[PDB]
Amino acid sequence: QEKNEQELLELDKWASLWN
Amino acid sequence: QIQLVQSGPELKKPGETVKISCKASGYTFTDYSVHWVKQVKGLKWMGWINTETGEPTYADDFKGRFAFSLESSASTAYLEIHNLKNEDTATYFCALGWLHWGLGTTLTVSSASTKGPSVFPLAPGTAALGCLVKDYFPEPVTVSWNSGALTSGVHTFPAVLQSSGLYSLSSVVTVPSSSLGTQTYICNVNHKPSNTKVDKRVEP
Amino acid sequence: LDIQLTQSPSSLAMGQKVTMRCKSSQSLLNSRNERNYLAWYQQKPGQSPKLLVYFASIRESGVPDRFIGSGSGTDFTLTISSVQAEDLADYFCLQHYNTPWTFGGGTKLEIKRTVAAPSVFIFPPSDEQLKSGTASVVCLLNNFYPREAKVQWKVDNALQSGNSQESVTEQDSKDSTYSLSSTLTLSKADYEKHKVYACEVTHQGLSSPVTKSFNR
């Protein structure tokens, strides 16, 4: 739940770093 | 768990070429862009390299003399600068986007040869005295007073790069006027790159 | 169409709460994921930048919670709830919304103390350096606060420009003051064409300019 939100945040983080 | 290890300090002459490396670990190297930033006194973004395709992208002020390259199998990125100029003097960082910056590689580009400093006295309630440490290359110089015994009110200034292309700095200290006759004041200057050491007694 | 970031203040002086701001010339909000593409970094001399806060308001893991980023669109702030001695550093914002990436001008965190006037000394060139054909005159401004200061060189009362270099120390470990040297360099040939040498200091702790001088 808040775990989804934290996982999401990491996925957004790394997505922003992708080639 | 992310680390970016960069190559060591560079000392080059105008016209030469330097190659700086950035070794990445703790992540999938070919998935994330590597960026390069120049810091002289603010920060200047140089561009980025696509770690998937190998394609480099250069900021406007960094077009002709700069090359971004990779050894993907080695998880390493490279910055190559050709026809080096004095103003290329700076710290260069690679970065994993905004997430994590390398430790940086300092580059100094100069035509100057290694040279020991000349050391002059800054004579003589409170009195000020000091040592002028003039015309040396490259950095760094270190100064103490009375072999480390005197540190109160000692200010040793950051070096300036002079018009001549040589560095200069001063180290100063404030003492009572009363002690000038009786106390001994000696600045110990060390310029290791030339193995120059000087002890300069400073007198009223 | 390079995005501009204006960071303020350029410096602030603290165990209280401090605030620095970053204003973007264009929104950094990504409609797609609703994140703001702005990060805050700390950097200490000789060291590399350290990420404090990303996506405007997310603290990076392990970063002390006294650090708080907030804001959206074009307006962003970094707050340090309670300044510690380890937090004395430069701080800057970075926008990574569009290339080229751009940075704020930085904010330096120093220690606040009372106003202290500088003591002023002028140093003639030593006889030994004159032997070698160049003269360096030194003006010291010792133990002042705050850092802002103005120095002017006057030779035979003529105002000197372009021929001096200044250098300044970091905040003193003991008394939180600053010192500053200004060095006037000229040929012994130009040196020996003139007689009176003065440097004029302007500082908040001084009700009016202080001049120190000497003549050959």
UniProtKB/TrEMBL annotation, chain B:
It is found in: Cell membrane. Disulfide bonds join 131-187. Residues 117-203 form the Ig-like domain. This is IgG H chain. The modification Cysteine sulfenic acid (-SOH) is found at residue 159. The lineage of its organism: Eukaryota, Metazoa, Chordata, Craniata, Vertebrata. It comes from the Eukaryota.
From TrEMBL, chain C:
It comes from the Eukaryota. Zn(2+) 2 binds at residue 143. Residues 118-215 form the Ig-like domain. This is Ig-like domain-containing protein. The lineage of its organism: Eukaryota, Metazoa, Chordata, Craniata, Vertebrata. Disulfide bonds join 139-199. The chain holds residues 126 to 236 of 239 of the full protein.
